[PDB]
C-alpha cells in the first residue's frame, strides 16, 4: 500500500521530467552545427615513447606545468616522466600492485593513487630527505577506487565501486562529505574548472552532478544504454561528455539537463575506455577497445581522425594543460605522446 | 646552469633505470593467481591448508614464487573489476556444488560468464569441486534434491573411466561426476584452444591443492610456449 503509492508517485515525477526535458528541446545541436566548417583530416604521429612500465598501464595524469606526468601500472609502480627529455624523475613502489587510478596535485607537490585496495595514498614529492614517502592514507571506503582528483593540497575527492563518492581532508585523514545518490559502481569523475562541482558516471548508465560545498545531488542525466566507463568535463565548465560499453559517446550540458549529440558509427562495436576534451573543446579524443583512439569532433558528429599506434587496448589518455601534447596509456605497458 | 641540470637529470634516469631493471627480474619470477571462490564455498580453508579490498597471500612451491589474490570486501557486482585480472596466469574457481538448497546453478552461470568473457577468453580457469565429503552425505540422504533441481541426473550414466575413491559407493560417484560433466560441457562448448578448464575434486583441508594448481600452472605455460611455435 504505502510502498505501491510511493512508486506510483515516483513514476509521475519521472514522467514530468520527461515532459519538461522534451519542452526545452526546441532544437538539437546537430542541426545548428550543420553549416560549421569541418576540422579536416587530423593526422597525428608519435613523438615520444616511454617504455619504463612492465604491466598494463591503467591510469595517467598530466601536471599543471605541462612537463611532468605521473602514470599508474598494474605491476605496482608510479613513475614520474619528464615528457620533454623522456627521462623519469621518480619511481615509487606501492604496497598494492592493483591500482586503477592516479592523480597529480595542481601545486605539483603531491601525487595520489588508488585501486582494489579500497584506500587512497598521498605522496609528497618535495621531501627534504631526497626520497618520496607516503604521507596520509585514507581508509573510509569499502570498495575498489576508480578515480581521484585534487581540489588543492588539503582536500581530495575520490570515487569507488561503493556507489558513493567521498570528499577527504588530507591533514586529518578523515571523511568530510559523502555522496550517496547513485545505484551502481562509479567508474570516473571530472572536476569543473571552478572546482565548485563535479560529475561522475556510474554503472547505472546515468551521470550525476554534485556540489562539493553541501554534498547534495543537483540533477541526474540519463540516455545511455550501458554502463558508463569514462567521463570528462568541458573546458568552458558548462558541459561534459562520457562513453559507455554501448560503443557510442554522448555529450551533455548542465543547463539544459538533457543529451545533445551522440557519436557512433556502424563499424564501432567496441566500448569506450577513456574520454577527454581538447584545450579548445573542439576535439573529443576517446579511447576504444579496438586498440584505436578516434578523434571525434565535438560540434560535428562526423569523425575527424584516428590514431592506432597502440599494440593493446587503450586504457587511459590525457590532453596537456597547455594543449601542446596528448599522452595515451594502453595495456601494452607503453606510454605514447602525440602531437 | 642548464648544463648542470642536464647532468642531474641523466644520473637520476640512470639510477631509476637500474632499479627498474632489478625489479623486472623479481616481477617476472612470480606468477599471479586469482581466487574467485563463490560465497560460503570454503575458499578460506583452501587458502589456509598450505576494510581491505584484497588479501594478497604469497606461497612458494618447488622454489617457484606464486602470488594468490583473494578479492574480499567487494560488492557482488563483479562486472567491472574482473577485467583487471586479464593478465593473470589462471583464475582459480572454487565451487561448493554440494551446498545446493540452488548454489550449483548460480555457480554454473558464473562459470559460463567467466568462460565467455572477451578479456578472459585467453585466461585458463582451473576448477575445484569442493565439499566432496558433504556431497556424499547429502546424496546418501533419502530423496536427495539433486534430481529435482537437475532432472537429467535420472538418465545420466557413469562413464567407464571414472575411478572411485576407495571406500565410496556408486551413487556418490554418480553425482560427483555428473556435476563435472556439465562444467566440462560448458567449457568445451566454446573453448577452441584459447584457454582450457581443469576439473578437480578437493576436500576442505586437502593439502594437495597447492600441488594441483602448481601442476596445472605448469601445463598452462607449456601450452602457451607450444602456441608460440605454432605447434598447437
Amino acid at each position: 500500500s504505502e510502498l505501491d503509492q510511493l512508486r506510483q508517485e515516483a513514476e509521475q515525477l519521472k514522467n514530468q521530467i520527461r515532459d519538461a526535458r522534451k519542452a526545452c528541446a526546441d532544437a538539437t545541436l546537430s542541426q545548428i552545427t550543420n553549416n560549421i566548417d569541418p576540422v579536416g583530416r587530423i593526422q597525428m604521429r608519435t613523438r615520444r615513447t616511454l617504455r619504463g612500465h612492465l604491466a598494463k598501464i591503467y591510469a595517467m595524469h598530466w601536471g599543471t606545468d605541462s612537463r611532468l606526468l605521473v602514470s599508474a601500472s598494474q605491476d605496482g609502480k608510479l613513475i614520474i616522466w619528464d615528457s620533454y627529455t623522456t627521462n623519469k624523475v621518480h619511481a615509487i613502489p606501492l604496497r598494492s600492485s592493483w591500482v586503477m587510478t592516479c592523480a597529480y596535485a595542481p601545486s605539483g607537490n603531491y601525487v595520489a593513487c588508488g585501486g582494489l585496495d579500497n584506500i587512497c595514498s598521498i605522496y609528497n614529492l618535495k621531501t627534504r630527505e631526497g626520497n618520496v614517502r607516503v604521507s596520509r592514507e585514507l581508509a573510509g571506503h569499502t570498495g575498489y577506487l576508480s578515480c581521484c582528483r585534487f581540489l588543492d593540497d588539503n582536500q581530495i575527492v575520490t570515487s569507488s565501486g561503493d556507489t558513493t563518492c567521498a570528499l577527504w581532508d588530507i591533514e586529518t585523514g578523515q571523511q568530510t562529505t559523502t555522496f550517496t545518490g547513485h545505484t551502481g559502481d562509479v567508474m570516473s569523475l571530472s572536476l569543473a574548472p571552478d572546482t565548485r562541482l563535479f560529475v561522475s558516471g556510474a554503472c547505472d548508465a546515468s551521470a550525476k552532478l554534485w556540489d562539493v560545498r553541501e554534498g547534495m545531488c543537483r540533477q541526474t542525466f540519463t540516455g545511455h544504454e550501458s554502463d558508463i566507463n569514462a567521463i570528462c568535463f568541458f573546458p568552458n565548465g558548462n558541459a561534459f561528455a562520457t562513453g559507455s560499453d554501448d560503443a557510442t559517446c554522448r555529450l551533455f550540458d548542465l543547463r539544459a539537463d538533457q543529451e545533445l549529440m551522440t557519436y557512433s558509427h556502424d563499424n564501432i562495436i567496441c566500448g569506450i575506455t577513456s574520454v577527454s576534451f581538447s584545450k579548445s573543446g573542439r576535439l573529443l579524443l576517446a579511447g576504444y577497445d579496438d586498440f584505436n583512439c578516434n578523434v571525434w569532433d565535438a560540434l560535428k558528429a562526423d569523425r575527424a581522425g584516428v590514431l592506432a599506434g597502440h599494440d593493446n587496448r587503450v586504457s587511459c589518455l590525457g590532453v596537456t594543460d597547455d594543449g601542446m601534447a596528448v599522452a595515451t596509456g594502453s595495456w601494452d605497458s607503453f606510454l605514447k605522446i602525440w602531437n | 646552469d642548464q648544463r648542470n641540470e642536464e647532468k642531474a637529470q641523466r644520473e637520476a634516469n640512470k639510477k631509476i633505470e637500474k632499479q627498474l631493471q632489478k625489479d623486472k627480474q623479481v616481477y617476472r619470477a612470480t606468477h599471479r593467481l586469482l581466487l574467485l571462490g563463490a560465497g560460503e564455498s570454503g575458499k578460506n580453508t583452501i587458502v589456509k591448508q598450505m576494510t581491505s579490498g584484497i588479501f594478497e597471500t604469497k606461497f612458494q612451491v618447488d622454489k617457484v614464487n606464486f602470488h594468490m589474490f583473494d578479492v574480499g570486501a567487494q560488492r557482488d557486482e563483479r562486472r567491472k573489476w574482473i577485467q583487471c585480472f586479464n593478465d593473470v596466469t589462471a583464475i582459480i574457481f572454487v565451487v561448493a556444488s554440494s551446498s545446493y538448497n540452488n548454489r550449483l546453478q548460480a555457480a554454473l552461470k558464473l562459470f559460463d560468464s567467466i568462460w565467455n568473457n572477451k578479456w578472459l577468453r585467453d585466461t585458463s580457469v582451473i576448477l575445484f569441486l569442493n565439499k566432496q565429503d558433504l556431497l556424499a552425505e547429502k546424496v546418501l540422504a533419502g530423496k536427495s534434491k539433486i534430481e529435482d533441481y537437475f532432472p537429467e541426473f535420472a538418465r545420466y550414466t557413469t562413464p567407464e573411466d571414472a575411478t572411485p575413491e576407495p571406500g565410496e559407493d556408486p551413487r556418490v560417484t554418480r553425482a560427483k561426476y555428473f556435476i563435472r560433466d556439465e562444467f566440462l560441457r560448458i567449457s568445451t562448448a566454446s573453448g577452441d584452444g584459447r584457454h582450457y578448464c581443469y576439473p578437480h575434486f578437493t576436500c576442505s583441508v586437502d593439502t594437495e591443492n597447492i600441488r594441483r594448481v602448481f601442476n596445472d600452472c605448469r601445463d598452462i605455460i607449456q601450452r602457451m610456449h607450444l602456441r608460440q611455435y605454432e605447434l598447437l
Partner: nanobody
Amino acid sequence: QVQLQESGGGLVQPGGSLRLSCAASGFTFSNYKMNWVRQAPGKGLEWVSDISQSGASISYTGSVKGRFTISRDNAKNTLYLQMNSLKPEDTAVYYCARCPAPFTRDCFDVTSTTYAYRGQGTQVTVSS
C-alpha cells in the same frame, strides 16, 4: 531511461496455465541477451532461463525444463514466458533482467541483488 516493464501474473490453480510478458524500452531490443530470474518468498534470487540475441539459442534451468516456454519478439520488443502444469513452488516474484553489454554473449550480475537493468517485477502466486 532503461526500464523493463512487466505485465501478467495473477491467481492460478495448480496444474493450470499462465503467460507473462516483459516489455523493453529505451534500448535496442535485439542487441541484448534476455534472462528470466525470480525471487521466492523468504529465499534468495535464482535464475530460470535465457534467450540469445537472435533467439536461436535457448537454455533452461533443470527445475522448469519441459514445464515453461520462453519466447522473444524483436519486432515488438517483448519477452514472453508461457507456463503449463504449474506446481506449488512456482509462487515467486518474477524479474525481467538483461545483459548490460549488448554485443557479448556473456554477462555478470544478472542475479545480483543490486542490479540496475532489471524490471520492477510481477507477483505470481499459485494455490488451491
